[PDB]
Amino acid sequence: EVQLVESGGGLVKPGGSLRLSCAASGFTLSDYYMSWIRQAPGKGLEWISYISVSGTKIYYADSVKGRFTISRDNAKNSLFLEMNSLTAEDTAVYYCARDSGSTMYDGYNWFDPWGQGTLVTVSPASTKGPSVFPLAAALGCLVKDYFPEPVTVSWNSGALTSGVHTFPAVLQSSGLYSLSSVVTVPSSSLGTQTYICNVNHKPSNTKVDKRVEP
Amino acid sequence: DIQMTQSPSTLSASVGDRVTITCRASQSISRWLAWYQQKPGKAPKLLISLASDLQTGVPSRFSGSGSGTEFTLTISSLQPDDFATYYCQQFDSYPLTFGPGTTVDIRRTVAAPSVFIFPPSDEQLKSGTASVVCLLNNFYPREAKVQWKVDNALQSGNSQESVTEQDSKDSTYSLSSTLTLSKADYEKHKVYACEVTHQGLSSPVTKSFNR
Amino acid sequence: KIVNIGAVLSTRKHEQMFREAVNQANKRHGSWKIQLNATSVTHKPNAIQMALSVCEDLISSQVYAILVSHPPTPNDHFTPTPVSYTAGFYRIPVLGLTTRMSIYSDKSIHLSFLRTVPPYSHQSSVWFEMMRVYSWNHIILLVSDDHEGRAAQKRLETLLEERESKAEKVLQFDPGTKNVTALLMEAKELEARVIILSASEDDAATVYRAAAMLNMTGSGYVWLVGEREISGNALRYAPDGILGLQLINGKNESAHISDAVGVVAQAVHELLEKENITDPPRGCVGNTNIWKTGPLFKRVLMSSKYADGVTGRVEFNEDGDRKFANYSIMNLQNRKLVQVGIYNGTHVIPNDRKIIWPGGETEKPRGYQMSTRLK
Amino acid sequence: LNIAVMLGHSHDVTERELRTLWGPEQAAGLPLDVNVVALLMNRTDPKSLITHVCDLMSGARIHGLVFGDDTDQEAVAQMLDFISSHTFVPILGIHGGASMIMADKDPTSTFFQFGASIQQQATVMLKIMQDYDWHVFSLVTTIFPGYREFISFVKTTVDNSFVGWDMQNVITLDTSFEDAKTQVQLKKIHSSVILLYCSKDEAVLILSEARSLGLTGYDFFWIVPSLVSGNTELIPKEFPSGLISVSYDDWDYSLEARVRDGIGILTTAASSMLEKFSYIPEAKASCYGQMERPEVPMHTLHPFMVNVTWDGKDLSFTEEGYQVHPRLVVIVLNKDREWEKVGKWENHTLSLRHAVWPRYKSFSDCEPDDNHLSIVTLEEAPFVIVEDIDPLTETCVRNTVPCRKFVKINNST
Ligand SMILES: *[C@@H]1O[C@H](CO)[C@@H](O[C@@H]2O[C@H](CO)[C@@H](O)[C@H](O)[C@H]2NC(C)=O)[C@H](O)[C@H]1NC(C)=O
Ligand SMILES: *[C@@H]1O[C@H](CO)[C@@H](O)[C@H](O)[C@H]1NC(C)=O
């Protein structure tokens, strides 16, 4: 069994430097080619660069050319990726996978197997309490300008489940995510039936509960 | 460089039905192309190498085809574990460009989407930021042309649309058409129209609003 | 001095690297006002379209040499047969970067064909040398009913006749056969232990499965299979302890194309400084004349020497094949490939790594089995 | 079914159409030959050849073709074999670019030739050597891989001495013509019938060296293969009149007869294919845009051509593609440097004599013929005994000298 472990990720402010460690298991890393590929949330996949066996030929992507550094440790069988001048476009999950350069002869570049990967996000803001802004036919609640990572939202302390579904967090230019908790209810349910959306941001331990009115 | 186009972007099929994926390259790249399958929340896995070779540990139902600049992926029988997003990566020359998504999922029926719009609350208005969100629900497929016509003017670069995933039980879809505006701009506007074009609702139902 | 090089390179990165190597060779060693020109064409899957496009884009461009590379893809052919045959109508020399087929070895089938890698002749030579230096005198040949297998068998027999030795059994089986159990039983009912195998990937996998199910993976059996059977299902089902070959530098496209460009540039410079060269026909269609300097160019390439390449000295045999090519005796260890022996300069130099034999043998086995059952 | 034919010169349209009409009607073939198409061209460009073959593939669904090239190019046969392999069409080689057969067909190919292979050519040469009272021989060749197969076949035949003439000493050396090799090799083991086996230039050089040495005149003859005498109208000045070559030509047949037997064989093979499994096989619609792998849904014509009989004058083909019964006549250069037909190896794979005894033709530099003489003898009883060669083991003279005799059928004649 071959498994690839990705670590070294976390939260880094824009313009900082971060190191990504790609742990390779089940095979010898010295006699194989490795590459880094990113995939933005909701977008396609972008190849970054590849590391040769000799280590003297690396093709950085045009978007990240001259900014990233790639290193390998044959004895440790691990791959180390160094990134500098992180920007908004770098907010993507980076996966390291075994290439196909050494598979038959050369040139082939299919990637297999793929590790679980790591998430790198840039945010010029520290931990802060969420600012839940409810809305007002159906009802919903919007959570805007919050960070860190999204927190599950329950309606009526979990009692309400018909149509209760959240949405993926959307990163803003200020480094704060944003999502809306919307529940599909009949137009006659306004006023007669109560609806309270409960948000309990675990990192901040903030009990933000906002009532919904027409 | 080399740009790959997959048509349609989103498609659906039932279990046991033949599945065809079309991958077209900008230039002739012979057969130097590979296929991947990315589960939601999971890394992609290689399926077909050189568009004609089946990798070990992969079921025989998958079968690639195509040569030159046009490539085709064929599945003999669709199975529940095959519901994922597929890509056709090419390695003809650097940079290693990656193909767009496929979004293979299930086909349930043709259902009319539900469109709802919610005005900002009083606390949201007094908080300094006001946003209007248009709800999209139970629409097949994931594609749904939703746009904002504020003050009878086209709005672009501010509207945000997010879709989570197809429902497991009812095979429905949910999209949040969130519109980002400043509080003053929101107050200066009253008609937050949300017209939705979809297979279920052929008529462009517009959710006009007023103060 | 308006020489042009058409060449056939797979993909596009290989084409760009070939162009860069051509420019570097122009800007190094013997440099004139105009050394030569750089051109390339893709290796499209369709054989007929590839051949016609190559003829149109090379003959009309006044090419003196063409470099063609053969990808090792098993599912599709992608063979250099069409381009080689089209170049065979004229006398334009070609070079095979990754041509592992022995069909092109014969000059009657391919007149103006050359390559920088021996398909299996040097592999059989390495087999014979390893057998001689490891004290083996028995050969069980599993050559398949194919042209390359027959060529390898003929080369092995010629090498054996040098020392007045003959294999006790040279039985052959048709490719794709699923009933090799009878052949394995016949091999068992013999006085030999060393087995020589050379077949395709599927045939190698089938015979490996048959050997595994017939208890042929135990002690006393030595396998010296070639490089072609250490990939795919053959590698998946290969029993532990097989001493294979690696063909050091791993048919590297970059190194091979650099060496080919250097050799072509040196040969073109020597031809220009020696005598006149007949101009190639201006069009792929219109004339059927035979090039009057083609055999001369072939002789120059045959006698050409190149010592500044990655593999040091580069020379061609009487069949236009690489001489003293680097080979690595690869021994499977715990389902992993481990380097043990290295072949270079017709020498065998085992390393500190132990060559474990099938059946968990620690000592060197013997090729002679005294059955003591002389009928 | 809708077969095709091509030619370079001579029979342009009318003769080919007449022969293709007369062929199928001579037999009660189940398939109906609706029509044929004849193509006439001068040049033989590879791209032009490919375009013409694909055009013939499109219309009438190909279903076989006959190539009648006139240029003496060896690569034409290779290109035709490649086309047949990559488009699955049965093709029969005729005089011209396919006159010589030296390439090894891939299994996916369905290409055949009317030429004579090296393996059978050696047998024909040995059968000719059986006559003319020749038993000792020695051959010299080059290092070409194709020549090594011929040497191996000759060695195996020598080791196969259960029947036929007693095998004599055979010594073979093959390398360059310098460093004191050709002279010493010709000086050693030179008794009778020295064989020459190489290409045009090497043959010219070897014969020039023999002329410069003491191996020419009324001495032993020389035998060369078909490839040496590639063109009957090409006679280099270095070739002595005593050269012996074996190669089919137009002194016993014609291009019209060759294309007639080819189209007859094609029609018989098509009929056999149609009757055997289901029907006459079809062909690919187009030669371009084949994304799918070159699979073979149909069945090859090899089982339908290995043993095919047509009007008794059939030419069966072996598994390798070589014809079992080639014409392969023997030609000996005339005293005025012309090639004349002598012997026919067609009658049940047996050589002929042509009533031409091995007269020692004088070369360019004449020498006195004080070597052979003539010793007339009479069979009285105790000193001369007339005996016939026993067709067993040796099948020739073993200890007794050869002898000649005359028959008497009628007193008047
Ligand atoms: C010299 O090489 C250049 C390219 O390096 C040739 O320019 C083009 O080459 C491509 C093939 O690589 C052809 O398809 C184009 O038709 C060429 N362009 C033109 C305008 O001809 C160039 O033709 C070469 N010149 C010679 C004399 O060989
Ligand atoms: C081929 O050789 C060159 C230099 O000789 C080297 O830079 C390159 O990495 C090699 N290719 C492979 C696939 O190892």
Beta carbons within 10 angstroms of residue C329's beta carbon: 22
Partner-chain contact B91 C11, CB within 8 Å: yes
- Bridge partners of D340, per DSSP, are D332
Question: Can you read off the two tokens belonging to residue D142?
Answer: 């080059």
Tokens of B85: 């997003």
The per-residue b/e assignment along C276-294, b for 16 or more CB within 10 angstroms, e otherwise, is ebeebbeebbeebeebebb
Ligand nearest to the CA of C42: 1
Report which residue type is found at B155: Q
* Burial D167-202, CB ≥16 within 10 A → b, else e: eeeeebebeeeeeeebeebbeebeebbbbbbbbeeb
What is the C-alpha to C-alpha distance for residues C285 and D46, in angstroms, rounded to an integer?
Answer: 7
Chain C: closest CA distance from residue D103 (Å): 5
Those residues whose C-beta lies under 8 Å from the C-beta of residue D86, and which sit 6 or more positions away, are: C47, C48, C82, D294
> What are residue B177's DSSP bridge partners?
B134, B161
Q: Are C267 and C282 in contact (CB under 8 A)?
A: no
Q: In what order do the strands lie in the sheet with C94-96?
A: C37-38, C4-5, C63-68, C94-96, C113-115
C chain contacts of residue A105, beta-carbon cutoff 8 Å:
71-72, 98, 250-253
A48 — phi, psi (to 5°)?
Answer: -100, -65
CB D330, CB D128: distance < 8 Å: yes
Q: Which one of C246, C247, C252, C257 would you pick to mutate in the ligand 2 pocket, going by the greatest count of ligand atoms within 8 A of its CB?
A: C252
Residue type, D174: D
Beta-sheet pairing, A118-121 with A10-11 = parallel
- Residue D224: helix, strand or coil by DSSP? strand
Closest ligand by atom to A104 CA: 2
* Choice from C5, C37, C67 to test ligand 1 binding pocket (greatest atom count within 8 A of CB): C37
Going from the Cα of C256 to the center of ligand 2, the distance in angstroms, rounded, reads 9
Q: How far apart are CA A137 and CA B151, in angstroms?
A: 22
Cis preceding-peptide flag for A113 (omega within 30 of 0): yes
Indicate yes or no: CB of D47 within 8 angstroms of CB of C52.
yes
CA angle (D375 as vertex; D369, D377 as ends), nearest 5 = 165
CA distance A107 to A101: 6
Q: H or E segment at D206?
A: helix D200-212
Beta bridge partners of residue A183, listed in sequence order: A139, A164
- Residues with Cβ within 8 Å of D366's Cβ and at least 6 positions away in sequence, in order, are none
The residue whose CA has the least distance to atom 9 of ligand 1 is: C39
Q: Are A133 and B121 in contact (CB under 8 A)?
A: yes
* D180: its two tokens: 């004191």
Question: How many Å apart are CA C271 and CA C294, to the nearest integer?
Answer: 11
Dist CA D304 CA D306 (whole Å): 6
Distance CA B117, CA B146 (A): 12
d(CA D186, CA D372): 22
Pairing of strands C4-5, C63-68: parallel
B161 touching chain A per CB within 8 A: no
**How far apart, in whole angstroms, are the C-alpha atoms of residue C327 and residue C309?**
17
Q: How many CB atoms lie within 10 A of CB D352?
A: 18
Angle of helix D255-276 versus helix D14-25 axis, rounded to 10 = 40
Judge contact between C306 and C263, C-beta under 8 A.
yes
Alpha-carbon torsion angle D44, D47, D53, D54, nearest 10: -170
- What does the alpha-carbon distance between residue C167 and residue C169 come to, in Å, rounded to a whole number? 5
Tokens 């460690």 — which residue? A21
Q: Which amino acid is located at D52 in the chain?
A: H
**Residue with structure tokens 């050969």?**
C139
Helix, strand, or coil (residue D353): coil
| 3-state secondary structure string across chain C | CCCEECCEECCCHHHHHHHHHHHHHHCCCCCCCCCCEECCCECCCCHHHHHHHHHHHHHCCCEEEEEECCCCCCCCCCCCHHHHHHHHHCCCCEEECCCCCCHHHCCCCCCCEEECCCCCHHHHHHHHHHHHHCCCCCCEEEEECCHHHHHHHHHHHHHHHHCCCCCCECCCECCCCCCCHHHHHHHHCCCECEEEEECCHHHHHHHHHHHHHCCCCCCCCEECCCHHHCCCHHHHCCCCCCEEECCCCCCCHHHHHHHHHHHHHHHHHHHHHHCCCCCCCCCCCCCCCCCCCHHHHHHHHHHCCEEEECCEEECECCCCCECCCCEEEEEEECCEEEEEEEECCCCEEECCCCCCECCCECCCCCCECCCCCCC
Q: Distances from the Cα of D261 to the Cαs of C255, D66, D283, in angstroms?
A: 53, 11, 23
Binding residues of D for Zn(2+): 11, 95, 233, 249
Resolution in angstroms comes to 4.5
Which amino acid is present at A140? G
CB-CB contact of A82 with A51 (8 Å): no
| Residue D128: its H or E element | helix D118-130
Residue A153's beta-bridge partner residues? A199
**What residue numbers of D does the annotated binding site cover?**
11, 95, 233, 249
Ligand 1 contact via C4 beta carbon (within 6 Å): yes
Strands D4-7 and D37-40, by their bridges, are parallel
Backbone angles phi, psi at C201, to 5 degrees: -65, -45
A210 touches chain B (CB under 8 A): yes
How far C156 CA sits from the closest chain D CA (Å)?
15
- Cis omega before residue D368 (within 30°)? no
Handedness of CA B104, B107, B110, B116 (dihedral sign): negative
Helix (H, G, I), strand (E, B) or coil at B53: strand
Q: What is the C-alpha separation between C75 and D354, in angstroms, rounded?
A: 56
**Element (DSSP H or E) covering residue D270:** helix D255-276
**Other Cβ atoms closer than 10 A to C320:** 22
Q: Is B122 exposed, middle or buried (0-12, 13-18, 19+ CB in 10 A)?
A: exposed
The residue written with tokens 């050559």 in the block is C143
Check C109 against D102: CB less than 8 A apart.
yes
Q: In this structure, which amino acid lies at residue C182?
A: A
In angstroms, rounded to a whole number, what is the distance separating the alpha carbons of residues C259 and A32?
24
Out of D50, D106, D294, closest to residue C52 by CB:
D50
B118 touching chain A per CB within 8 A: yes
In sequence order, which residues have a C-beta less than 8 Å from that of residue D323 and are 6 or more positions away?
A: D112, D113, D114, D116, D315, D316, D317
For residue A28, give Cα distances in angstroms to A21, A88, D27: 16, 35, 72
- Chain C: residue nearest A27 by CA? C336
Of the candidates D92, D131, D125, the residue with the CA atom closest to the CA atom of residue D111? D92
Distance CA D8, CA D43 (A): 8
53-112 in C: which are within 8 Å (CB) of A? 71-73, 98
**Do B146 and B175 form a contact (C-beta atoms < 8 A)?**
yes
Tokens coding D213: 């040495």
Closest approach of chain B CAs to the CA of C213, in angstroms? Answer: 22
What gap in Å lies between CA D70 and CA D8, rounded to an integer?
5
Query: What whole-number distance in Å separates Cα of residue D219 and Cα of residue C86?
Result: 45
Rounded-to-integer distance, Cα D213 and Cα B43, Å: 81
Residues with CB under 6 A from ligand 2: A 52, 54, 57, 101, 106; C 252, 254-255, 310
Neighbours of A168 (CB within 10 A): 14
Q: How many CA atoms lie within 13 A of C82 on its CB side?
A: 24
**In what helix (H) or strand (E) does residue D331 lie, and over which residues does it extend?**
strand D330-333
**Is the CB of A41 inside 8 Å of chain B's CB atoms?**
no
As a whole number of angstroms, the distance between CA C82 and CA B134 comes to 62
Residue B17: which of B70, B102, B74 has the closest Cα? B74
D46: which chain C residues are within 8 Å (Cβ-Cβ)?
Answer: 51, 55, 85-86, 89, 284
Cβ separation D291–B66 shorter than 8 A: yes
Distance of alpha carbon D119 from alpha carbon D122, whole angstroms: 6
Contacts of B70 in chain D (CB under 8 A): 291
Cα(D207)–Cα(D229) distance, integer angstroms: 13
Query: What is chain A written as a DSSP string?
Result: --EEEEE--EE--TT-EEEEEEEEESS-GGGS-EEEEEE-TTS-EEEEEEE-SSS------TTSTTTEEEEEETTTTEEEEEEES--GGG-EEEEEEE-STTTSSS------SB---EEEE--SS--B--EEEEB---EEEEEEEEBSS---EEEGGGTB-TTEE-------TTS-EEEEEEE---GGGTTTS--EEEEEETTTTEEEEEE---
The total number of residues written for chain B in this structure: 211
The closest ligand to the CA of C250 turns out to be: 2
CA distances from D109 to B196, C220, D146, D301 (A): 61, 42, 21, 10
Q: Any residues with CB less than 8 A from the CB of B182 and at least 6 apart, and which? A: B129, B130
Of A122, A37, A29, whose CA–CA distance to A73 is shortest? A29
Judging contacts by C-beta atoms under 8 Å, the chain C residues touching residue A59 are none
Angstrom distance (rounded) from CA D408 to CA D413: 8
Q: Put the strands of the sheet holding A78-84 in their side by side order.
A: A3-7, A17-25, A78-84, A68-73
Burial class of residue D19 (count of CB atoms within 10 Å of its CB; 0-12, 13-18, 19+):
buried
> How many angstroms separate the CA atoms of D296 and D273, rounded?
15
How many Cα atoms within 13 Å fall on the side-chain side of residue C233?
Answer: 16
Cβ neighbours of B201 (radius 10 Å): 16
Q: Which of B5, B164, B19 is nearest to B104 (CA)?
A: B19
Structure tokens of C29? 């060693």
In whole angstroms, what is the distance from residue D181 CA to residue C173 CA? 41
Quote the DSSP letter at residue D402. Answer: P
> Whole-angstrom Cα distance, residue D158 to residue D169?
10
**Spatial distance between the Cα atoms of D55 and D39, rounded to a whole number of angstroms:** 11
Sheet containing A34-39: order of strands: A10-11, A118-121, A92-98, A34-39, A45-51
Quick one: which H or E segment has residue B75?
Answer: strand B70-75
Residue D318 sits at φ, ψ, to 5 deg, of: -80, 180
Locate tokens 């715990």: which residue?
C334
Distance between CA atoms of residues C213 and C254, nearest Å: 42
Q: For residue C368, report the phi and psi dihedrals to the nearest 5 degrees.
A: -95, 125
Q: Which residue has the tokens 């977008």?
A: A43
Angle formed at CA A27 by CA C233 and CA A52, multiple of 5 degrees: 100
CB B114 within 8 A of CB C33: no
Chain C positions contacting chain D at CB under 8 Å are 45-49, 51-52, 55-56, 75-77, 81-82, 85-86, 88-89, 103, 105-111, 147, 284-288, 290, 318-319
CB contact under 8 A, A107 and C253: yes
The number of the ligand nearest the C-alpha atom of C34 reads 1
Distance CA C105, CA D145 (A): 8
How many Cβ atoms sit within 10 Å of the Cβ of residue B14? 10
- Please report which helix (H) or strand (E) contains residue B126, including its range: helix B122-126
Helix (H) or strand (E) holding D48: helix D46-58
The SS3 call for residue D54 is: helix
